[PDB]
Design a protein around this motif. Structure first.
Motif, short mmCIF file in Angstrom:
data_model
loop_
_atom_site.label_atom_id
_atom_site.label_comp_id
_atom_site.label_asym_id
_atom_site.label_seq_id
_atom_site.Cartn_x
_atom_site.Cartn_y
_atom_site.Cartn_z
N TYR A 17 0.81 -1.22 0.00
CA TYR A 17 0.00 0.00 0.00
C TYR A 17 0.86 1.29 0.00
CZ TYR A 17 -2.55 3.94 1.76
OH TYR A 17 -3.04 5.19 1.96
N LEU A 18 1.96 1.30 0.75
CA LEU A 18 2.84 2.46 0.80
C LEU A 18 3.50 2.72 -0.56
CD1 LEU A 18 4.51 2.31 4.30
CD2 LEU A 18 2.55 3.69 3.58
N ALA A 46 0.40 -0.49 11.41
CA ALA A 46 0.34 0.72 10.56
C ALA A 46 0.89 1.93 11.33
CB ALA A 46 -1.09 0.98 10.09
N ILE A 47 0.42 2.14 12.57
CA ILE A 47 0.92 3.25 13.40
C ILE A 47 2.42 3.13 13.74
CG2 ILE A 47 0.61 4.71 15.44
CD1 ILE A 47 -2.43 3.90 15.44
N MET A 61 -0.15 8.79 4.17
CA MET A 61 -0.76 7.63 3.55
C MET A 61 -1.44 6.64 4.52
SD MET A 61 1.91 6.83 0.40
CE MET A 61 0.61 5.50 -0.35
N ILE A 62 -0.84 6.41 5.67
CA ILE A 62 -1.48 5.52 6.68
C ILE A 62 -2.72 6.21 7.28
CG2 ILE A 62 -1.17 4.41 8.97
CD1 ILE A 62 0.30 2.97 6.55
N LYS A 67 -8.52 6.02 7.63
CA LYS A 67 -9.76 6.76 7.50
C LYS A 67 -10.67 5.94 6.59
CE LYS A 67 -9.64 11.23 6.41
NZ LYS A 67 -9.13 12.54 5.82
N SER A 68 -10.12 5.47 5.47
CA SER A 68 -10.91 4.68 4.52
C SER A 68 -11.44 3.37 5.11
CB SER A 68 -10.11 4.36 3.28
OG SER A 68 -10.93 3.66 2.36
N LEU A 69 -10.59 2.62 5.81
CA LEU A 69 -10.98 1.33 6.42
C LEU A 69 -11.98 1.49 7.54
CD1 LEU A 69 -7.44 -0.46 6.70
CD2 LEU A 69 -9.24 -0.80 5.03
#
Length: 127
Positions: A17-18, A46-47, A61-62, A67-69
């Motif tokens: 994803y990154l 992710a964090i 990006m994370i 936000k999306s998930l």
């Protein structure tokens, strides 16, 4: 200590994803693990990635991925909560090896809060 294969899959998903910025690919890959009760590990990993990263691209990006998930119901309220609490627990360990981590964490938490994806009380639990 062998690599927990679920930790490994989540790490690969995040790293891909990154590179691409493909949130859809990330969401599909996550759901295919069929591991909804382990989504706190995705949040945590992710964090940590944000905290260990240099500069701002991983952070931005994370933030967008989380936000999306959250907005698609892919990450549930209590999985978000458990993931952040793990970060809050480990942040003294993390900050010792990555200096200025408390400051990056605080800004990331405030952005998540301003995005509407975490409650006031989770925001306030940030050390």
């Amino acid at each position: 200590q062998p690599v927990n294969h679920l930790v490994k899959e989540i790490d690969m998903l995040l790293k891909e994803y990154l590179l691409s910025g493909d949130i859809s690919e990330a969401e599909h890959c996550l759901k295919e693990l069929e591991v909804p009760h382990f989504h706190h590990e995705l949040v945590y990993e992710a964090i940590v990635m944000v905290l260990e990263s240099t500069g701002e691209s991983a952070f931005k990006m994370i933030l967008d991925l989380l936000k999306s998930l959250w907005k698609s119901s892919t990450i549930t309220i209590d999985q978000m909560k458990r993931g952040y609490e793990r970060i809050y627990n480990e942040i003294p360990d993390i900050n010792l090896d990555v200096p200025h981590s408390y400051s990056v964490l605080e800004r990331f938490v405030e952005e998540c809060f301003q995005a509407g994806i975490i409650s006031k009380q989770l925001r306030d639990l940030c050390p």
